[PDB]
CSV table of C-alpha atoms (C1' of nucleotides) and ligand atoms in Angstrom, one decimal:
chain,number,residue,atom,x,y,z
A,42,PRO,CA,38.0,72.8,4.6
A,43,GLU,CA,37.7,70.3,1.6
A,44,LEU,CA,40.4,67.2,0.5
A,45,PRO,CA,43.1,69.3,-0.4
A,46,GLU,CA,43.4,71.8,2.4
A,47,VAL,CA,43.0,68.6,5.1
A,48,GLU,CA,46.0,67.0,3.2
A,49,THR,CA,47.8,69.7,3.7
A,50,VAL,CA,47.2,69.3,7.5
A,51,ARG,CA,47.7,66.3,7.2
A,52,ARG,CA,51.0,66.1,5.7
A,53,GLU,CA,52.0,69.5,8.0
A,54,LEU,CA,50.6,66.9,11.1
A,55,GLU,CA,52.8,63.9,9.7
A,56,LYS,CA,55.7,65.9,9.3
A,57,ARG,CA,55.8,67.6,13.1
A,58,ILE,CA,53.9,65.7,15.9
A,59,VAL,CA,54.6,62.1,14.4
A,60,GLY,CA,56.3,60.1,17.5
A,61,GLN,CA,55.4,62.7,19.5
A,62,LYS,CA,54.1,61.5,23.2
A,63,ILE,CA,50.2,62.8,24.8
A,64,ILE,CA,51.0,64.4,28.7
A,65,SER,CA,47.7,65.6,28.3
A,66,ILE,CA,44.9,66.0,27.0
A,67,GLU,CA,42.2,69.2,27.6
A,68,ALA,CA,38.8,70.1,26.4
A,69,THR,CA,37.1,73.4,26.8
A,70,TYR,CA,34.2,72.1,24.3
A,71,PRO,CA,34.4,68.4,25.4
A,72,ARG,CA,30.9,67.8,23.6
A,73,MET,CA,32.6,67.5,20.5
A,74,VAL,CA,33.9,64.2,21.0
A,75,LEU,CA,30.9,62.3,19.7
A,76,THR,CA,32.3,59.5,20.9
A,77,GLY,CA,33.0,60.8,24.7
A,78,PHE,CA,35.6,63.4,25.9
A,79,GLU,CA,36.5,61.8,29.2
A,80,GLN,CA,36.8,58.3,27.3
A,81,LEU,CA,39.1,59.8,25.1
A,82,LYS,CA,41.1,61.2,27.5
A,83,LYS,CA,41.4,57.9,29.7
A,84,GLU,CA,42.5,56.1,26.5
A,85,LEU,CA,45.0,58.5,24.9
A,86,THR,CA,47.0,59.9,27.6
A,87,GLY,CA,50.1,58.4,27.0
A,88,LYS,CA,50.1,57.0,24.2
A,89,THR,CA,52.1,58.2,21.4
A,90,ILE,CA,51.0,59.2,17.4
A,91,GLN,CA,52.2,56.8,15.0
A,92,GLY,CA,50.4,58.5,12.0
A,93,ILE,CA,48.0,60.6,10.4
A,94,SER,CA,45.6,59.4,7.6
A,95,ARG,CA,43.3,61.1,5.8
A,96,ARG,CA,40.4,59.5,4.2
A,97,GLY,CA,38.2,61.9,2.2
A,98,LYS,CA,38.1,65.3,4.4
A,99,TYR,CA,38.2,63.6,7.5
A,100,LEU,CA,41.9,63.3,9.1
A,101,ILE,CA,42.7,60.1,10.8
A,102,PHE,CA,45.3,60.3,13.5
A,103,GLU,CA,47.1,57.0,14.6
A,104,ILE,CA,47.5,56.7,18.1
A,105,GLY,CA,49.2,53.5,19.9
A,106,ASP,CA,48.9,50.9,18.0
A,107,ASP,CA,45.0,50.1,18.7
A,108,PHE,CA,43.5,53.7,18.1
A,109,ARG,CA,42.2,55.7,15.2
A,110,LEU,CA,41.1,59.5,16.3
A,111,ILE,CA,39.2,60.5,12.7
A,112,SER,CA,38.5,64.5,13.3
A,113,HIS,CA,36.6,66.3,10.9
A,114,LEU,CA,37.3,69.9,10.4
A,115,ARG,CA,33.2,70.8,9.0
A,116,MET,CA,33.4,74.1,8.5
A,117,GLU,CA,35.9,76.4,9.9
A,118,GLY,CA,37.8,73.3,12.0
A,119,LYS,CA,41.7,74.7,12.0
A,120,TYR,CA,44.5,73.0,14.2
A,121,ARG,CA,47.6,74.6,15.5
A,122,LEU,CA,50.5,74.0,16.7
A,123,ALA,CA,51.6,76.6,20.0
A,124,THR,CA,54.2,76.7,22.9
A,125,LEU,CA,53.1,75.1,25.6
A,126,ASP,CA,52.0,78.6,27.2
A,127,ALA,CA,49.9,79.8,24.5
A,128,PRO,CA,47.4,81.6,25.4
A,129,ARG,CA,43.6,80.6,25.1
A,130,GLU,CA,41.7,81.9,21.7
A,131,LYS,CA,38.2,82.4,22.0
A,132,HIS,CA,37.2,79.4,20.3
A,133,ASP,CA,39.8,76.5,20.6
A,134,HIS,CA,37.9,74.1,21.8
A,135,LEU,CA,40.8,70.7,22.7
A,136,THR,CA,44.6,70.7,22.9
A,137,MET,CA,46.6,67.5,23.2
A,138,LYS,CA,49.6,68.7,24.8
A,139,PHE,CA,53.2,67.2,23.9
A,140,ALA,CA,56.3,67.8,26.1
A,141,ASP,CA,57.5,70.7,23.7
A,142,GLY,CA,54.2,72.4,22.5
A,143,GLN,CA,50.5,71.5,21.9
A,144,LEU,CA,48.2,70.9,19.0
A,145,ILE,CA,44.6,73.3,19.4
A,146,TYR,CA,41.6,72.7,17.7
A,147,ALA,CA,40.1,75.4,16.6
A,148,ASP,CA,36.0,75.5,15.0
A,149,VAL,CA,34.1,79.3,15.1
A,150,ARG,CA,30.8,76.8,13.9
A,151,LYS,CA,31.5,74.0,16.6
A,152,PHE,CA,31.2,71.6,13.8
A,153,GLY,CA,34.0,69.7,13.7
A,154,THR,CA,33.8,66.8,15.5
A,155,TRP,CA,36.4,64.1,16.9
A,156,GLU,CA,35.6,60.2,17.4
A,157,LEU,CA,37.8,57.6,18.9
A,158,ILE,CA,37.6,54.2,17.7
A,159,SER,CA,39.6,51.0,17.1
A,160,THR,CA,42.4,50.4,13.7
A,161,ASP,CA,39.6,47.3,12.8
A,162,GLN,CA,36.9,49.3,12.6
A,163,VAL,CA,38.0,52.7,10.4
A,164,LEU,CA,36.9,50.9,7.1
A,165,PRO,CA,33.7,49.8,8.9
A,166,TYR,CA,33.2,53.5,9.5
A,167,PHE,CA,33.8,54.5,6.3
A,168,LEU,CA,31.6,51.9,4.2
A,169,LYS,CA,28.9,53.2,6.8
A,170,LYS,CA,29.3,56.9,6.1
A,171,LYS,CA,29.2,55.6,2.1
A,172,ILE,CA,32.4,57.8,1.0
A,173,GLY,CA,33.6,57.3,-2.4
A,174,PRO,CA,36.8,57.1,-3.9
A,175,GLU,CA,39.9,59.1,-3.6
A,176,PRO,CA,40.5,61.6,-6.4
A,177,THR,CA,43.4,59.6,-7.5
A,178,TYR,CA,43.8,58.0,-11.7
A,179,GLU,CA,44.3,54.5,-9.3
A,180,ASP,CA,41.3,54.5,-7.4
A,181,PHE,CA,38.8,56.9,-8.6
A,182,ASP,CA,37.5,54.6,-11.8
A,183,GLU,CA,35.7,56.2,-14.5
A,184,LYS,CA,33.6,52.8,-15.8
A,185,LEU,CA,31.2,52.9,-12.4
A,186,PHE,CA,31.4,56.7,-12.1
A,187,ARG,CA,30.1,56.6,-15.7
A,188,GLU,CA,27.3,54.2,-14.5
A,189,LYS,CA,26.4,56.0,-12.1
A,190,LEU,CA,26.0,59.1,-14.1
A,191,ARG,CA,24.3,57.8,-16.7
A,192,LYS,CA,21.3,56.0,-13.7
A,193,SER,CA,20.7,59.2,-12.0
A,194,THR,CA,18.2,62.2,-12.7
A,195,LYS,CA,20.1,63.7,-9.8
A,196,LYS,CA,21.8,67.4,-10.8
A,197,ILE,CA,25.7,66.7,-11.0
A,198,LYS,CA,26.8,69.5,-8.6
A,199,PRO,CA,25.0,68.2,-6.1
A,200,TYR,CA,25.2,64.6,-6.5
A,201,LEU,CA,29.3,65.0,-6.4
A,202,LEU,CA,28.6,67.5,-3.2
A,203,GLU,CA,27.1,64.3,-1.9
A,204,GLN,CA,31.0,62.6,-1.7
A,205,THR,CA,29.7,59.3,-3.0
A,206,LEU,CA,30.8,59.5,-6.5
A,207,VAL,CA,34.4,60.5,-5.3
A,208,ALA,CA,35.7,61.9,-2.3
A,209,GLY,CA,36.8,65.2,-1.3
A,210,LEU,CA,35.5,67.7,-3.8
A,211,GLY,CA,33.6,71.0,-1.4
A,212,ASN,CA,31.6,74.3,-2.8
A,213,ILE,CA,35.3,75.5,-4.3
A,214,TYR,CA,36.3,72.9,-6.0
A,215,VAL,CA,33.0,71.1,-7.5
A,216,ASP,CA,32.5,74.7,-9.1
A,217,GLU,CA,36.2,75.4,-10.0
A,218,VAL,CA,35.8,71.4,-12.0
A,219,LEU,CA,32.7,72.2,-13.5
A,220,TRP,CA,33.9,74.8,-14.6
A,221,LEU,CA,36.9,73.1,-16.2
A,222,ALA,CA,35.0,70.5,-17.3
A,223,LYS,CA,32.4,73.1,-19.4
A,224,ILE,CA,29.2,71.6,-17.3
A,225,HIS,CA,27.0,73.5,-15.8
A,226,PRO,CA,26.1,72.9,-12.1
A,227,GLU,CA,22.2,71.7,-12.8
A,228,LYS,CA,22.8,69.5,-15.7
A,229,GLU,CA,21.0,66.1,-14.9
A,230,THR,CA,23.8,63.4,-14.7
A,231,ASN,CA,22.1,61.3,-17.2
A,232,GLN,CA,22.1,63.6,-19.9
A,233,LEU,CA,25.9,63.7,-19.8
A,234,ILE,CA,27.5,62.0,-22.8
A,235,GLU,CA,30.8,59.6,-22.6
A,236,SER,CA,33.1,62.0,-23.7
A,237,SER,CA,32.0,64.8,-21.2
A,238,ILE,CA,32.2,62.6,-17.8
A,239,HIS,CA,35.7,61.7,-19.1
A,240,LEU,CA,36.9,64.9,-19.2
A,241,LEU,CA,35.1,65.4,-15.5
A,242,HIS,CA,35.8,62.7,-14.4
A,243,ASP,CA,40.2,63.7,-15.3
A,244,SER,CA,39.0,67.4,-14.0
A,245,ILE,CA,38.4,66.1,-10.9
A,246,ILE,CA,41.7,64.0,-10.2
A,247,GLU,CA,44.0,67.0,-11.9
A,248,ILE,CA,42.4,70.0,-9.7
A,249,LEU,CA,42.4,68.4,-6.4
A,250,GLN,CA,45.7,67.3,-7.6
A,251,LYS,CA,46.6,70.7,-8.1
A,252,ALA,CA,45.6,72.0,-5.1
A,253,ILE,CA,47.1,69.4,-2.9
A,254,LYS,CA,50.4,70.6,-4.7
A,255,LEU,CA,49.7,74.0,-4.1
A,256,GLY,CA,49.0,73.4,-0.4
A,257,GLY,CA,45.2,74.0,-0.8
A,258,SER,CA,43.4,77.5,-1.0
A,259,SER,CA,43.1,80.0,1.6
A,260,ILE,CA,40.1,82.2,0.7
A,261,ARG,CA,41.2,84.6,3.9
A,262,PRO,CA,44.4,84.4,5.2
A,263,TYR,CA,45.1,82.3,8.9
A,264,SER,CA,47.5,81.6,11.7
A,265,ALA,CA,47.5,77.9,11.6
A,266,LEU,CA,48.1,74.6,10.3
A,267,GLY,CA,47.3,74.5,6.4
A,268,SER,CA,47.0,78.0,5.8
A,269,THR,CA,50.0,78.8,3.7
A,270,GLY,CA,48.3,77.7,0.1
A,271,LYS,CA,48.5,79.5,-2.9
A,272,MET,CA,45.7,77.6,-4.9
A,273,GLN,CA,43.3,80.3,-4.3
A,274,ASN,CA,45.5,82.9,-6.7
A,275,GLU,CA,44.3,79.7,-9.4
A,276,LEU,CA,40.5,80.4,-8.9
A,277,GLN,CA,38.7,80.6,-11.9
A,278,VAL,CA,34.4,80.9,-10.9
A,279,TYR,CA,34.3,80.4,-7.2
A,280,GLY,CA,34.1,83.9,-5.8
A,281,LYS,CA,34.5,85.5,-8.9
A,282,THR,CA,30.7,87.0,-9.2
A,283,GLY,CA,31.3,89.6,-11.8
A,284,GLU,CA,34.6,89.1,-13.0
A,285,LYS,CA,35.2,87.8,-16.2
A,286,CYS,CA,36.3,84.0,-17.0
A,287,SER,CA,39.2,83.4,-18.3
A,288,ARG,CA,38.2,81.6,-22.0
A,289,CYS,CA,35.9,83.8,-23.3
A,290,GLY,CA,35.2,86.7,-21.0
A,291,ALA,CA,31.4,86.5,-20.0
A,292,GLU,CA,31.0,87.7,-16.8
A,293,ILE,CA,31.0,84.7,-13.7
A,294,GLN,CA,27.9,84.5,-12.6
A,295,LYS,CA,26.7,83.5,-8.7
A,296,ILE,CA,22.8,80.8,-8.6
A,297,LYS,CA,21.6,78.7,-5.9
A,298,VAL,CA,21.8,75.3,-6.3
A,299,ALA,CA,20.8,73.1,-3.5
A,300,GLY,CA,21.1,75.6,-1.5
A,301,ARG,CA,24.4,76.5,-2.2
A,302,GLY,CA,26.2,79.5,-3.3
A,303,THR,CA,27.5,78.5,-7.0
A,304,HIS,CA,29.8,80.3,-9.4
A,305,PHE,CA,30.1,79.4,-12.9
A,306,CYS,CA,30.6,80.8,-16.7
A,307,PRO,CA,27.4,80.7,-18.7
A,308,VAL,CA,29.1,80.5,-21.8
A,309,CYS,CA,31.4,77.7,-20.8
A,310,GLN,CA,28.8,75.8,-19.0
A,311,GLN,CA,25.7,75.6,-21.3
A,312,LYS,CA,22.5,75.1,-19.3
B,127,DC,C1',16.6,95.0,14.4
B,128,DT,C1',15.8,91.3,10.4
B,129,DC,C1',17.4,88.5,6.7
B,130,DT,C1',21.5,86.6,3.9
B,131,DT,C1',26.1,84.3,4.0
B,132,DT,C1',29.8,80.8,4.8
B,133,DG,C1',35.5,75.4,2.7
B,134,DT,C1',29.8,70.4,5.9
B,135,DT,C1',27.4,66.9,7.1
B,136,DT,C1',22.9,64.8,8.2
B,137,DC,C1',18.2,65.2,9.3
B,138,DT,C1',12.8,65.7,9.0
B,139,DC,C1',9.0,66.4,6.3
B,140,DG,C1',6.0,65.1,2.8
C,194,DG,C1',13.7,55.8,-2.2
C,195,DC,C1',13.4,61.7,-3.4
C,196,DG,C1',14.2,66.8,-3.2
C,197,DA,C1',13.8,71.0,0.0
C,198,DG,C1',14.4,73.1,3.2
C,199,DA,C1',17.2,73.0,7.5
C,200,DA,C1',19.8,72.1,11.7
C,201,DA,C1',23.9,72.1,14.4
C,202,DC,C1',26.2,77.0,15.2
C,203,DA,C1',29.3,82.1,14.9
C,204,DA,C1',29.9,85.7,12.8
C,205,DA,C1',29.9,89.1,8.9
C,206,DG,C1',27.2,91.8,5.5
C,207,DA,C1',23.5,94.6,3.9
D,606,ZN,ZN1,33.9,81.4,-20.5
DNA sequence: CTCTTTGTTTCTCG
DNA sequence: GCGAGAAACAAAGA
């Protein structure tokens, strides 16, 4: 998932599990707890979930008064709230059991991670990750963005995917943003003029906020939290290879850019 | 059978 | 430092 999908999960978890006491924690794949599963089980069993926050694509469970469970869903991670008698599914890895249900984490590719850290370690954790600003008008300063783009010869799509200029774009929304801002994904960032950078800055905020409002993009239907999204119906280029650009009628093309499938309109996004 | 592809991140290599 | 390529892993499609 990307930031809008993680935010959608965050909001659903906030509504449903805040106030829940963790009765037990079980793992069939304990190695995805990078801080140690048995340590996490000992520390968190019996504690109450107080909140759920997000930074970039990271989910943050606030548990007890001093614990923060940092969860990254990577490519395929999925949470669901299930009955206590729910049958195991093949790629379920972890569960937090409450009195009236359980929160199960599944991840086909086993890429997702859990890390248990303390409250005062959260800000240093993300500083060490070098995560850039949240994609909001308040936090995403166009002036610093412009200065960083001016200094670099990196290509704009890979640079945006780094999470350092701004947090939260992945392959879907970076392709969507670059189409909206009429920028080719291989454009070296020091070639972007001020007006293009301004449009890019605003487009990043606008499409991620739109995606949040619509509950994220569900490319396939799934049975988990954050799976009732509608933003997939608004995608203009991602996965639209061979379909016509909604602005100019040219066929959307797919190329490979720094190892990633990349969808663009060759007319609207001049090389 | 092989090769490629996939919502992410983070590594080695030269 | 940099880019290119690949790995962590599993499944589906060509
Ligand atoms: Zn076009």
